[PDB]
Amino acid sequence: SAYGKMLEELLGPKQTYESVTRTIGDIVLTPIRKTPWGWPVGFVIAALGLLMYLFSLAVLFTVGVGVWGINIPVAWGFDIINFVWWIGIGHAGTLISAILLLFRQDWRTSINRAAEAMTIFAVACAGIYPLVHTGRPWLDYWMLPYPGTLGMWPQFRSALEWDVFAISTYATVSILFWYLGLIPDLASLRDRATNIWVKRFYGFLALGWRGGARDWNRYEVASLILAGLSTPLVLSVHSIISLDFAISQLPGWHVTVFPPYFVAGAVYCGFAMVILLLVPLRRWYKLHDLITIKHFDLMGKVMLASGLVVAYGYFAEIFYAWYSANIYEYFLITNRTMGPYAWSYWALIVLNVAIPQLLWFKRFRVSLPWLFFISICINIGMWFERWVIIVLSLHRDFLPSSWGYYTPSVWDISLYAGSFGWFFFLFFLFIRLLPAISIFEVRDLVHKTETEKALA
């Protein structure tokens, strides 16, 4: 069958419902003092990143927001380049979780929990940055519409107030669509426990689920609606993290194709992180029969299909910067190609629209040592896109007497390099305590391969 030969590319060898539940219920329920190595040495490397995170924040609150190196021309720096980068990472974690669930696609099934959880920890690492880039961070509750004894409310015309409304909707429905997905899954880890103090842990995280058609029908009509509510959300969230440049009148910022080209770069940099995280989750956790290489052949095609929309984005915003007869957008082209930060835009054309244009060929998509180098050049490269958008439009602007430079200090590096600690502190807590693959959905994928072989 033409449909059966699609579903057999996702699993591979002989697999039943128990052999699928066993190989995901052995990543979890393998007890401590029996837990395999790699996870101890990574959870204490992430602790040194978290103690670089919590020290750079304890510095930041005490001495101030001006240990970063942000100038007065360029007053948004690594606090915002890494914030749009981290928000950009978790967005393709919900293209995998929500947008592909609209398309009834079955190759999103095993990539689900390693993208639902990867969204959340790229938002908990992100969402600290709108709370700590403010100079007075103890008043970020003033960006909330609450009644007080002041008659003051937030503005609701600024696109940083909508960043409050986008992320505090994005952070809460990421942890409500990943926890709803874990309601029928932690009921399976509960029944495979045979240890009552880890059975009560997964017997209370899963609320008491039982299966049941009156609960399974209510689950998926609350899942695809949630997958239909998280799909205009993430096309809006990283559009709302895109409006807080495009609302501003700056020459490199006030372009109107920022809302679809940022979210294209979010499902470009984000698929690069799912590829950068799942290639070391097959070689280290033996998931060669669930994360089979057709999942990377399709994650590479969607990363390619998203990397052309930002290849379109770099050429449109360099066309309409010339097509506008402004001297300020004529200068924008001659400040990304020339000028002091021309190396950033040429390490952007190389790392985004030259090196991952090998994604057309299957030779650099099925080969994981080539898909890893391509995706590692997107995380470095899409950081440089958000550097070119933010810094190169800020550090040289309308008036020549306000031209700055923004060379970052150590506390801009230590907060960003410390932010990967808080990602992998929680990711390695997710791998150990929770399943990395949604067991009940891949049980349906095993059931879907059997029900199409029985149609012969």
């Binding site: 519409p145 008659g151 003051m152 409310w153 503005q155 609701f156 015309r157 696109a159 107030e161 909508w162 409304f165 986008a166 505090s168 909707t169 809460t172 429905v173 409500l176 669509f177 709803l180 058609a213 009156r214 029908n217 209510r218 009509v221 609350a222 609606i225 949630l226 509510l229 998280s230 205009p232 959300l233 809006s236 969230v237 559009s239 709302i240 409006l243």
Partner: protein, 64 residues
């Protein structure tokens, strides 16, 4: 089971988040504390839509 009435609970709370956040920023900018901020009009019907949409997604998923 004949389906569930649950999607109408999601829509009933989505129409309460869309019309509840659009009427929140309108009551703020017109009735409660109207501010000449940027020369922009009091009933800015743009710039209320990216904040009444995320309140529509939020209260729908809180009912989902």
């Amino acid at each position: 089971y004949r389906g569930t009435r649950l999607p109408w609970v999601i829509f009933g709370a989505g129409l309460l988040g869309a019309s509840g956040m659009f009427a929140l920023q309108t009551w703020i900018n017109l009735v409660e504390y109207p501010l000449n901020i940027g020369g922009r009009p009091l009933f800015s019907w743009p710039a209320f839509i990216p904040a009444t949409f995320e309140g529509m997604v939020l209260l729908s998923a809180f009912a989902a």
